[PDB]
Amino acid sequence: KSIGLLATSSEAAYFAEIIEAVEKNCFQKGYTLILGNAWNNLEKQRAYLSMMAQKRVDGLLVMCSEYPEPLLAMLEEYRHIPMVVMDWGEAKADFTDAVIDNAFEGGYMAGRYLIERGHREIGVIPGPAGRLAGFMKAMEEAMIKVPESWIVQGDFEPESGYRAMQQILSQPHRPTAVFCGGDIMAMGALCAADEMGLRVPQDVSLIGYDNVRNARYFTPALTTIHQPKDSLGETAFNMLLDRIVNKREEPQSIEVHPRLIERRSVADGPFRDYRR
Amino acid sequence: KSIGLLATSSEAAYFAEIIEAVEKNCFQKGYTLILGNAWNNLEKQRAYLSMMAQKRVDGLLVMCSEYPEPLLAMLEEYRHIPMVVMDWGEAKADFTDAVIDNAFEGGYMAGRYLIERGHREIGVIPGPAGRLAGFMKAMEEAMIKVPESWIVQGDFEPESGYRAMQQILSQPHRPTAVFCGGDIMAMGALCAADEMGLRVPQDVSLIGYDNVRNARYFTPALTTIHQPKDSLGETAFNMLLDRIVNKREEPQSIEVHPRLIERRSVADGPFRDYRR
Numbered sequence: 001k002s003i004g005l006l007a008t009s010s011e012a013a014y015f016a017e018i019i020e021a022v023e024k025n026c027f028q029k030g031y032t033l034i035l036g037n038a039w040n041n042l043e044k045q046r047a048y049l050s051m052m053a054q055k056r057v058d059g060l061l062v063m064c065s066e067y068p069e070p071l072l073a074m075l076e077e078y079r080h081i082p083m084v085v086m087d088w089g090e091a092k093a094d095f096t097d098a099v100i101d102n103a104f105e106g107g108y109m110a111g112r113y114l115i116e117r118g119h120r121e122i123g124v125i126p127g128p129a130g131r132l133a134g135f136m137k138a139m140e141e142a143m144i145k146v147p148e149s150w151i152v153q154g155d156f157e158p159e160s161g162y163r164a165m166q167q168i169l170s171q172p173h174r175p176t177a178v179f180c181g182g183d184i185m186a187m188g189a190l191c192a193a194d195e196m197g198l199r200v201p202q203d204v205s206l207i208g209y210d211n212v213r214n215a216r217y218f219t220p221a222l223t224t225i226h227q228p229k230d231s232l233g234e235t236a237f238n239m240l241l242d243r244i245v246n247k248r249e250e251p252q253s254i255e256v257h258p259r260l261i262e263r264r265s266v267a268d269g270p271f272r273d274y275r276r
Numbered sequence: 277k278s279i280g281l282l283a284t285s286s287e288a289a290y291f292a293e294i295i296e297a298v299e300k301n302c303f304q305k306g307y308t309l310i311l312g313n314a315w316n317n318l319e320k321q322r323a324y325l326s327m328m329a330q331k332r333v334d335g336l337l338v339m340c341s342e343y344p345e346p347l348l349a350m351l352e353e354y355r356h357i358p359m360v361v362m363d364w365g366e367a368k369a370d371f372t373d374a375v376i377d378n379a380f381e382g383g384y385m386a387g388r389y390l391i392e393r394g395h396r397e398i399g400v401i402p403g404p405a406g407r408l409a410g411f412m413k414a415m416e417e418a419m420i421k422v423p424e425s426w427i428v429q430g431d432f433e434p435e436s437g438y439r440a441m442q443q444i445l446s447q448p449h450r451p452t453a454v455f456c457g458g459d460i461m462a463m464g465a466l467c468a469a470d471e472m473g474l475r476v477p478q479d480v481s482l483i484g485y486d487n488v489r490n491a492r493y494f495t496p497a498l499t500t501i502h503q504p505k506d507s508l509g510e511t512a513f514n515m516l517l518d519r520i521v522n523k524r525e526e527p528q529s530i531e532v533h534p535r536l537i538e539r540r541s542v543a544d545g546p547f548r549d550y551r552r
């Protein structure tokens with residue numbers, strides 16, 4: 001009773017929560033976990049692949065940022081060992097299980113809550129895209145220009161959000177609201193504002209994305225887009241099961257929908273002049 | 277290379293930060309990790325053991341909170357497999373490696389710092405230790421008495437720190453500083469002080485324990501005790517890599533020392549008056 005788990009990075013703030021879910025379920029079902037953590041290397045990922053085969057694991061489970069031809073090749077050579085390939089976005093007619101998170105709808109929702117709160121001068125601390133694409137469509141649809149000097153890439157880690165917010169806030173003209181593409185990154189943004197002497201949400205409104213466990217325990221309690229992370233691994237982990245037992249060779253798609261969690265990091269903006 | 281890890285719980289406060297350092301070191305070398313959480317069932321651990329032997333892991337890391345004779349005996353059968361069996365707890369004359377975290381010392385440094393900064397009416401949010409004990413000695417030694425109404429425990433998680441902080445802060449009379457035995461928990465206390473209109477540390481000073489990865493980016497930047505978890509993880513790993521090749525049958529002692537990290541959550545107390 002063991003299961004392989006070939007990841008792209010346990011420590012990749014994005015994925016991470018998913019793993020914990022795959023994990024806690026295994027222990028919960030007293031299985032053994034055989035953790036492989038690649039990082040995009042045909043051989044390393046290969047290595048990890050054969051080893052789980054030799055340790056005769058009762059199920060596989062892949063989580064990959066990409067799925068290039070080579071990887072895809074290997075993956076087939078090991079079809080005898082039952083699995084679940086979590087493939088985000090691009091539903092390519094292969095044999096991978098499609099994960100549809102509705103990030104595009106996620107970012108949409110965020111950018112829209114801000115327009116509705118009356119903000120028109122907006123900042124964005126983008127991660128390393130669908131979300132973002134979502135946010136620009138509402139900005140576009142509302143005719144809000146976004147100065148390029150108010151768009152600063154983060155990396156999912158607090159120091160990046162800390163450096164990003166300070167860059168944005170530290171300009172003659174600044175926005176009244178900032179869209180943060182990651183709750184963790186948003187924790188580093190709340191800090192910088194505070195250290196600069198800015199009252200959040202009073203001087204700057206902030207909305208993040210994820211709804212990480214601690215997000216409600218931020219100061220202030222963080223308004224964000226709840227992205228079901230630890231629902232995905234439990235499902236993926238169940239698709240693995242049925243697959244090994246019931247012999248479910250026919251694939252499945254895991255799709256979720258985003259939801260806005262209203263809390264306390266967002267205030268009314270100056271454009272409450274237009275409507276009530 | 278495959279490495280096996282037997283632990284009571286991967287998700288337990290103390291271990292959590294230790295297991296991730298291990299994991300991080302594994303993937304760095306390219307090793308695979310075989311994870312198992314046994315929880316205290318002689319039988320279940322006795323099952324993970326046989327299987328790991330069966331999967332031919334190159335080495336074993338054992339960390340268990342308690343090692344009853346019977347666990348120790350079964351481990352003795354598997355001594356052909358290189359292992360590091362971490363033992364917190366009173367050093368015994370057996371093959372276990374000793375782990376010495378100097379918690380009582382961290383607790384004391386914490387108390388003392390508070391007392392030095394001028395506070396005398398202190399509150400406490402203990403975890404479900406020896407740190408608490410070392411904390412109380414710095415108290416007892418400065419004649420300070422800490423009332424029961426100002427002691428409320430948590431369980432490592434944020435809501436627990438929130439609820440206890442609210443409880444202590446809602447007292448007709450309140451401490452001027454609080455000792456939180458765990459940063460995560462402190463994350464919650466910090467949010468609680470805020471939602472009650474109290475400013476940290478203008479109105480209340482706060483000190484945590486651990487110095488978790490994000491602490492510096494808490495709001496405000498947290499004053500806490502750095503308790504080394506990553507170093508321990510690193511240390512055990514390397515000891516295991518050593519035994520794998522330099523097959524060493526000599527128990528080792530791992531000692532770490534806590535260190536105070538002065539950030540921005542603690543201010544001068546009323547009784548502060550010894551210098552600048």
Ligand SMILES: [Mg+2]
Nearest residue numbers: 020023286296
């Ligand atoms: Mg983990």
Ligand SMILES: [Mg+2]
Nearest residue numbers: 112113116117
């Ligand atoms: Mg509506």
